[model samples]
Target: DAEECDVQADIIVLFDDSSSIQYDNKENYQMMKDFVKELVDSFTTVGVGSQFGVVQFSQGVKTAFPLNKFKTKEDIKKGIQDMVPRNGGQTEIGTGLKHVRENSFSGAEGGGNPDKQKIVILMTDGKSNAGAPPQHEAHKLKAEGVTVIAIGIGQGFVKTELEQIATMKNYVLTTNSFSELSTLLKLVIDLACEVCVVDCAGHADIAFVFDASSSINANNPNNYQLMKNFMKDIVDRFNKTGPDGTQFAVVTFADRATKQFGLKDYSSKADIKGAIDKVTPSIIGQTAIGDGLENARLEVFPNREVQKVVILLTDGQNNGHKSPEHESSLLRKEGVVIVAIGVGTGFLKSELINIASSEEYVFTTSSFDKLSKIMEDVVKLACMSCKPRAHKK
Candidate 1:
């Protein structure tokens, strides 16, 4: 599994150094430095996957450092230590936010990465006393896909104002005083690294059920290959390095069902891809989707902890003994998610919808050659439900 700290992001910290902070609790500046150091150590490393920047604000904003200045952890620590509080001016929270968004987060000034998640962690003890309203600036950042997390300290901090400054209510954090701010370090780290851990297992058990009747491959031998490629693409999205990774199984249906592999058949990507390659189209048979679904549930998927999923791909309506619709209902009642893909015009849309867990789970393509076009969409749908519960935090 990938480490939680591996999340890639461009983070800009907006520090408040107004006169109130200098007069009431000037020593808290050291506490702020400690907080920044802890956060940098946990969520980022200089010149690594994540980048860090700092902007101090009073009546005006000061770029203590841009995202690309420090290239090592020690350099970042030293930079934070050297950050002197410029106290005496009024708090300009709005101007600070706007400055970071426009100048500090830009590639020209802040060395921002366009592909990385843009984040702004604002630390303040008072409301905006100069410049524009913070809400308007916060909204602009939200529109630009920048996640703003507001941390308010001391009794002078305003809860409603912090809420207005943050992108979401959960992003707004508060503490009784600067000394107690360290208590929320874990929470902040968890939130910052949440996006980085998407490649980890979603705790899902997924089985691919393919219709390998002659009708699908006799005219086009490439259909089986396309199906295999699609399966591989979906598998690539999950963690398959160990037992804790998302487990996968394969099943193919023609006139009868065949269990090509079970979840325990492979624990590595190489072995899984080899298993997929071995799946061939049946020479002579009709589609037996119901049998495939039944066998997949009873024999392939034995795990109960993770989300259970079945990607059923067929080109024709079932001509087998069992009812595909009834079998799908049974699976759904058991909390199994079914994603049905109908390739070519041989299959009916209503049948695909009925066989799937929901209408959104049903997909179709004009021909086998065009199947690749929909793989991106299908993979997205399959992985959307596979996320682990802990990652949601």
Candidate 2:
């Protein structure tokens, strides 16, 4: 349900400054510097958003600028322009990585905001030949949840070695010349921005009410797990505990509804995911969409004046005693935003249309398997943008 949105991260650009890059190919070194400024332009820098750090490695690594050195893009660009690569030394990537983990992200200079994801963009003309073991250092960085993107330049660099240094094979980029690296700027930006970004660190009560009737797994047995996985994915994207953090609840319905967990029960992402793991389908009953929505309203929501939402997913038409049309309208009229999704051929679009707070809040799919494809967008719209309508007169 989520992809292609804005993200925030803490990034350190580590460029090669060995003899090959500095003395042998001075122009390419300038090009590499030029690319850092270009890449930094893609994000909203400083404060709680993305920030840039510049480092150059040869026999040793030097921090040209720590993450907090510049607050604005103009200042950061100027900082990049002032960089001078090393004159001569062996390539010591491991030393550079170890130094970055220790110094670049430290409290004094790096701004060390634990909220931002840590990323290291390393540019190298060749493999490591000095100091510590590069792969071992790379492992240490990854273990600390740091993503390393290795850019291998020209014929001097080893593609195999870059893969070892990168967090994964996909993070290893290559080009014949440093100047031509400009061609891959967008790709680099796209890869760097691939993060779970949620700016709404503010308070909210998010209630996920899903249908787990027998029909949900009648056609495909895996649909139940897919549905659960989709919800967990949404939960992970939100902040869970702070002054204005998010609260979550999971309610499932079949012949009747169940409060799998209250909105206030689990306040952390991990705890909520653990709760979701135990949610099971009602393999013996029919759909009870209204019951689920009602349970969420009366039992899940804490009656607070915060951002409240009722996101419901169902695979079949309501076949139980309670009717969702009136129940959903009740929740909407009470100032609860309802984002409804109807899945499988057994679903009725009109049912979902009436169930949602507004026409725009309704979604449908012929297959439950394809539900995850929209999981990112769904969470983005519901939690991040969707607003509750005015109370019905």
lDDT of 2 by residue, 1-393 (tens): 111214567889887788887655658767887888777765654433568888888877788898887878888999999988775469888999999888888888765787777888988888888899887888788667676888888887777677667754556789888779988776676666655233556566788899888887888889888888888888877755422488788899888899998876776788888889889887765888889888887887753346677889988788867878888867876667688888877778888866875444568877878998788658765564322121111
Top candidate by TM-score: 1
Query: Which window of ten consecutive residues has the lowest lDDT sum in model 1?
Result: 384-393
Query: What are the clashing pairs of model 2?
Result: 1-374, 1-375, 1-376, 1-377, 2-375, 2-376, 2-377, 202-244, 203-244
Which structure among the candidates has the greatest lDDT? 1
Model 2 lDDT-worst window of ten: 384-393
lDDT, residue 14, model 1 = 92
Q: What RMSD does each model have against the real structure?
A: 12.5, 15.4
Which stretches of candidate 2 lie above 4 Å from their native place? 1-5, 46-48, 196-393
Error of 1 at 378 (Å): 22
Model 1, span 1-393: residue lDDT tens: 212355677888899988787677668889889999877876544466578889999889888998888877778889989998889478888888889878987877555566787878999988787888888888787667677888988877687787667754446788888899988786676656544122335666788999989887767777779888888877887765336877788999998899998887788888888889988888866998889888887888764256677999999988867788888877876767788899888887887777775555678888877877887767655664422212222
Clashing residue pair totals per candidate (backbone < 3 A): 1, 9
RMSD of 1: 12.5
